[PDB]
Symmetry: D2
Subunit: 489 residues, 4 copies
């Protein structure tokens, strides 16, 4: 009795338990879940990797240890008592054969529910999926598979990578990851919109001038530039995160909070988006900053791991349109990039000027902002009479900052909420087959054209806000930026 | 034109009834603060006038007033009084008023100067004072404006008569009728909040609002001078003037401009759609002392010697009004006020309708917009948010703006400062107009008479409580939904 | 419903000899009597410079318009109520005996007096002066009806309007604008404020533009000399069209009370910025060689008109109302003489539907209210092409008074107007401030036109007018679809 | 091509060609389609039935003949040259075996598209479906089956049947009939709503007070009362026709005019309807009228074919609600019945009183009416200043009557447009599996309760408007009727 809406044994298999993702995220998260007592009484964690690692308490406690607490020492040891290891190659039935045995070896292993987390590279996916289905499936109880990277590099190829999994496991077993869907503020979007009347009748083309979905990271490609170069900022962030936020911000009210009823409304939106036009795109690549220090001086190409003549973009601003009765004509600006002046992700709606102005154009457009991170907050920039002996109005805002209002409660990491969702069996925060299909449908034409004609991205100094061209794009499409807005704490 | 923040002309601020309580405790201090912050024009002189052959500017004056003096200000302070002067005389014999006029012309350029007469004295005298001023003290050159303190009289007859009297001597654009609430920061802000924001436009109407509540509460009872208040009753005292005004600002249609008259027009247009108050939508109450309290808290209304032992005058009243027009047809405006209550506040609150087609299994609560006029001026909207943390269900929370933190520097001016300045700058927008006054009486007199006739006994409520339970029962019946399930932290 | 039950009333027709009197005022007043709308004790007193015999004499010889055989009885009955008086519109002596003659009538000193000024604006100043001194009734009301409020200049019209306002108070002055009395024009208010199907749509969010049209098939029938002093703007736009605009754009009034309504009207005018020379198209008609009769003679071919005139006979102007409801929506006022037909209508073209699913086969909806002829109101909308078809096409929901209400005869504007004067309803009459705002808007343009004397665009008699006008409408927002069929 | 975005052979197999439905509706219709040259050039008609029938031209021109024209004699004989007959039982593979053979015997039978119309009793459906799938399916070209009565009777026995057909044929071959979806005015509903701005912003709870879907027949159960007694008016008309109209009236704007995109929007509506409450139901049974003549004197029970102690309803008025942001709270009144005063089927919406009345309650609520039949017309009752010397307003209306406005064009019978739809492959006007499901989901609880407690229906004299109680229901739920409305031609 936990899932907010008897007990049995569960086995959390961590495929690629030796990988960076496993030791730095997956493992920590699973322990936190156990720590707060969210994991069912009978749970066992079984790591699996290519290497024959030292003891299930020796190595896997040596490598991971992120956020340990002195007084937690007891429960900590208690946790490892649930942990175990198995080594093997990700392709020879022999290795997978002893894994299965090992699980049945566990108290009630044949009865337990099996949850497989694929914390490893997309290449191996095809094979891993294959093996798991044959030799490791539980005869009783459920089996679920979590895919860390639902993306490939091409439509028709990822179509096969996808299809293959779909021919072995049915959709209600496939849990595709997009961690942003598990962040406090992102989930909140649905509540803010559908449980409030002050936001209902305004959410439409008659009131909204444009929507801006932003994603910024202050650091560049910390040495591993070689890897990133294969995907490009679009495939890395825009295609998945921003798009999801877009869906949540534009979908129609669902029949209920049921996983599928919600996802249905999401995809319905995607089906109304026409393919991206090259005319609404701005690409940029970062160059090192001479006045900086450390990584700040080294530009993208200064990374030895990246091919000397690369044109891969680290920054991209794209404009999309939703063609339906509600958003017809409203621009959705997706802007993202690495090596910028800060770190943040927010949704911002700028509304239309008030009709029949009686204040001699002193007014500025209202805006609703939902800051996902950092310092999760939501506020509405509006007008108010300039306080004091003044007649004219000025900008101000109605604010809600979780940091002060809810100073006690600690916000869980995306992964905790997500994994728990998996235990509960709530696919609502996970990507569905058709959602994937539509995401490719929209971007492939552009992506293809980019690789073909290989456009040279606009250079932008490390630490700036990016190419001026991006701002000029936003303005042209409808966004009005007012540098006249003061803020204090 | 200029934002009243720029004016060289000479100006004369005559304080009629300069010896009165209001003069020495509010008018005088306010005029000095205006001077102190350099808001009054360079050539401005202050002339106090009163019955007593009072000891000049530096003598009985500065002795009586002194409210909020600052050490290092001593210079500008003395500078101020060099501009001050006094004149004694009776409020009815031409002879006295004759020398007043002379005294003004005596001042450097008195005959050219703009004259502003603040009537800081009892309504009885208004008739005569107004009569004389018009004859012997009017300036031949430059404007002449008269500030009227108490726009309302004892009876419907008495006031309508006087208004007509003043209106025959002076034209509307010289008459500045006072209702100090119109000069409070938050009350003025109402218009900006409504008409300069799109997030508040398409929601302000019967399709989205369930009810509006205008509240006015004072924690103290009638501090000893119960005798006076007894004549007026809570309705005349607060509801008829203040609360009604806020109602106008909350329900008026968008004006053609910010021009004083264009605005006032839209205000009265609203009053014209309010049907006379029904005795069925009224809750009256009178306060009784509290035995567990201390000091004044133990003495009830009737325990005041100044009040007639068998009084039935109300100290609390909750009334429901309706505006019959395309916008507010059917929406209840609840005006609730009272003395000797649990706190001190004045706010406007709008409660919106339940969302249509609920998908959260009635866990939702109606949204609300709150504009707290005082204390700690703030405005906020109570809405729903996903319970923070590992939770799926939503809970109440709010988007807030508190002037005390966001604007911790700027000091908010007293209503009278902004108002008096308005008089200098010639902006009648924050003052009551003849027709507004009438519509006010039009609405309340039928009820007021009935009360004086049948003399209903008010419901007793212990000093310090929130008032008669019946009032709350009224609010609920008429449309308001209250739910004590709302937490708040700083 | 028409409900001091019956008091005596005197209908003084000043200028009883004039064309307007014998051709409109007299006939109308008799129609009101005939149908039994006039109070029992009513007497008609014509007055004019000449001494046109007795009542039943020249004033039955001159008028006679629409007589019916069997009515002969009531007809004679009517004239027994009529009388006449001669005199000059300026010497106290004449007006003196007029007053006497009125008191001579059964209860003249008790009777209500209604002075209809059916004479030229020049004399107004005088007539008004005299009537106030020697002809005012000591008991009962006195109401004066001003045929033309608008004069030649702004300085003059104003001076006059105020001269009258210093003698009589607003509630005695009944300024005319006959269009306010036409069936369909009054109906506007009911169509808008008594229906829900039209409420939420009447605003910038749905409406793309509004067109107020006024067309006459005939040119200036010989009397071109007189018209030349005003020009089409002052003649039709400045007054009629503008009024229709008011009724179409005003906010809902506090009640149907004359003043509560008029207030909402002028509120609109106050939000209209001065007309820009850039949104104006002027035209002057030229005769048609293939026509016949008047159709061959152009404007300048009229001897009465100065050989080198630049006065416009056609004008298309665009106006804007700057307020929360109409901000941005264009009001197209188009009018002209010597065109292809005769009609006056209000038309609203709505916006394209959002999120089209029929592959642009749709056309904008429109609401039309035809004031005349064949008074009707309809909405052009979309409907699935009837039969074995899937795609939609245009059609309409219609209401034509000619068939739906084939019995009832619609009264001439003047009947309803005059009656309104008797009942005391200024709602259908122009108010002082309304006139001021009307002047406020057009004088800037009007003066510029006279200053720079622009040459109007010539348009052949009988055509729809200058193409430029259409180009204006399109530019400003109007979309014309030649694809719309109509049968009976 | 007719529809927008050749000549293969086609075979129209009329299963149950001897039955009343065949000779009286199916056969005539197919000939009309042929007559207007709407059927493909290469089309052949094959009637199949139990009884050893004389030649098509022999015995099957004698039974049908409905709507023949003198001068059409030529094309008439031409038509019969395409017809043919086959006799056999609906169960023994032997019969079906020779049918298939006969089809292949036709010029290009093996290539031809096969269309199977099921014009026979629901009992045989299971078998026929079975046999057709085995021996008669076409190797090349499409195979579509048309079902006459998609509704059986009870949720389960009517689930069973569906599941059987859906296991032999896939959704895109099953064309479920509900002829009302093929009537001019019913189709028009979608165009009226979604192609007009004058009707957009009004279609919602903020403006509409109630919706009434009416279906009336002046004649009673003409002798064959026995058959009707098994279903009752609800199953017979309400559960199907009316409901469909409700869907079309309340559905949200679809992503496109694509058959499935539409149907999706339809079912989305049904999913929001809570089960019918016995408190919102009025049942009635007709009694004969002594002043009448002919059938008008014999009441329901006077029909020998009907069980002497029957309680089956010939009339029913039910109130349903759609719980969603658009229609939350608005009552949908579905009223129908036999032996009434007239014959008509219409959709009517009554709007709310204008807010802030200034005409001293002289106003009456606006209404939009779309009369499906007879004399198809659509109009809006509104207020207009009483014409003439009057100040006060009165009722009137903006009207559009097809009979006058479109006096030339003849409107096709539902079955013509429907059958053509099948050839064209447009399932948009046909019922989908999930739609039926939801239909029974809503009514079964009620239907059961009725057959259990056997309530006695309110008697209503033949020829009246029905039980006063029904009108009292309508008023109670919100509908305001004011007999003050005059109408002329
Ligand atoms: N920005 C800020 O500083 C800030 C922001 C949000 C909240 N807060 C604090 O939050 C606390 C509660 O917030 P709130 O005042 O907005 O909402 P609330 O207390 O839930 O209710 C507000 C209204 O309910 C009335 N009420 C209370 N109990 C009632 C009953 N039994 N029957 C009928 N009416 C009843 C209250 O009366 P009374 O008026 O007589 O109390 C008041 O008018 C307050 O102290 C508020 O100041 C402060």
């Amino acid at each position: 009795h936990v899932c907010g809406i008897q007990s049995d044994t569960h086995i959390f298999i961590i495929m690629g338990a030796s990988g960076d993702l496993a030791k730095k995220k997956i493992y920590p998260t699973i322990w936190w879940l156990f720590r707060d007592g969210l994991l069912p009484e009978n749970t066992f964690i079984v790591g699996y990797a290519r290497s024959r690692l030292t003891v299930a308490d020796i190595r896997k406690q040596s490598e991971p240890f992120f956020k340990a607490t002195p007084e937690e020492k007891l429960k900590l040891e208690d946790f490892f008592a649930r942990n175990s290891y198995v080594a093997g190659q990700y392709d020879d039935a022999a290795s997978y054969q002893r894994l299965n045995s090992h699980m049945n070896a566990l108290h009630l292993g044949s009865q337990a529910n099996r949850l497989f987390y694929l914390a490893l590279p997309p290449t191996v996916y095809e094979a891993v999926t294959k093996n798991i289905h044959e030799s490791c499936m539980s005869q009783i109880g459920w089996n679920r598979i979590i895919v860390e990277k639902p993306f490939g590099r091409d439509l028709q190829s990822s179509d096969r990578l996808s299809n293959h999994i779909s021919s072995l496991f049915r959709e209600d077993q496939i849990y595709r990851i997009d961690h942003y869907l598990g962040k406090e503020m992102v989930q909140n979007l649905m509540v803010l919109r559908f449980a409030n009347r002050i936001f209902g009748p305004i959410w439409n083309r008659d009131n909204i001038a444009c929507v801006i979905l932003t994603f910024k990271e202050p650091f560049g490609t910390e040495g591993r530039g070689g890897y990133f170069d294969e995907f490009g900022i679009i495939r890395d962030v825009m295609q998945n995160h921003l798009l999801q936020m877009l869906c949540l911000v534009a979908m129609e009210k669902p029949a209920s909070t049921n996983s599928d009823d919600v996802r249905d409304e999401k995809v319905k939106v995607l089906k109304c988006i026409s393919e991206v036009q090259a005319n609404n795109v701005v690409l940029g690549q970062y160059v090192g900053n001479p006045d900086g220090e450390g990584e700040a001086t080294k530009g993208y190409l200064d990374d030895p791991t990246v091919p000397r003549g690369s044109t891969t973009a680290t920054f991209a601003a794209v404009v999309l349109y939703v063609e339906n009765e509600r958003w017809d004509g409203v621009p959705f600006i997706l802007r993202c990039g690495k090596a910028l002046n800060e770190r943040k992700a927010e949704v911002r709606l700028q509304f239309h000027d008030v009709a029949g102005d009686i204040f001699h154009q002193q007014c500025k457009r209202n805006e609703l902002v939902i800051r996902v991170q950092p310092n999760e907050a939501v506020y509405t920039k509006m007008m108010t009479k300039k306080p004091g002996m003044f007649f004219n109005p000025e900008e101000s805002e109605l604010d809600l900052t979780y940091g002060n209002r809810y100073k006690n409660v600690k916000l869980p990491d995306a992964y905790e909420r997500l994994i728990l969702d998996v235990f509960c069996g709530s696919q609502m925060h996970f990507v569905r087959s058709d959602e994937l299909l539509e995401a490719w449908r929209i971007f492939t034409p552009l992506l293809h054209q980019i690789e073909l004609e290989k456009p040279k991205p606009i250079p932008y100094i490390y630490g700036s806000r990016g190419p001026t061209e991006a701002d000029e794009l936003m303005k042209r499409v409808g966004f009005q930026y007012e540098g006249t807005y003061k803020w204090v704490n």
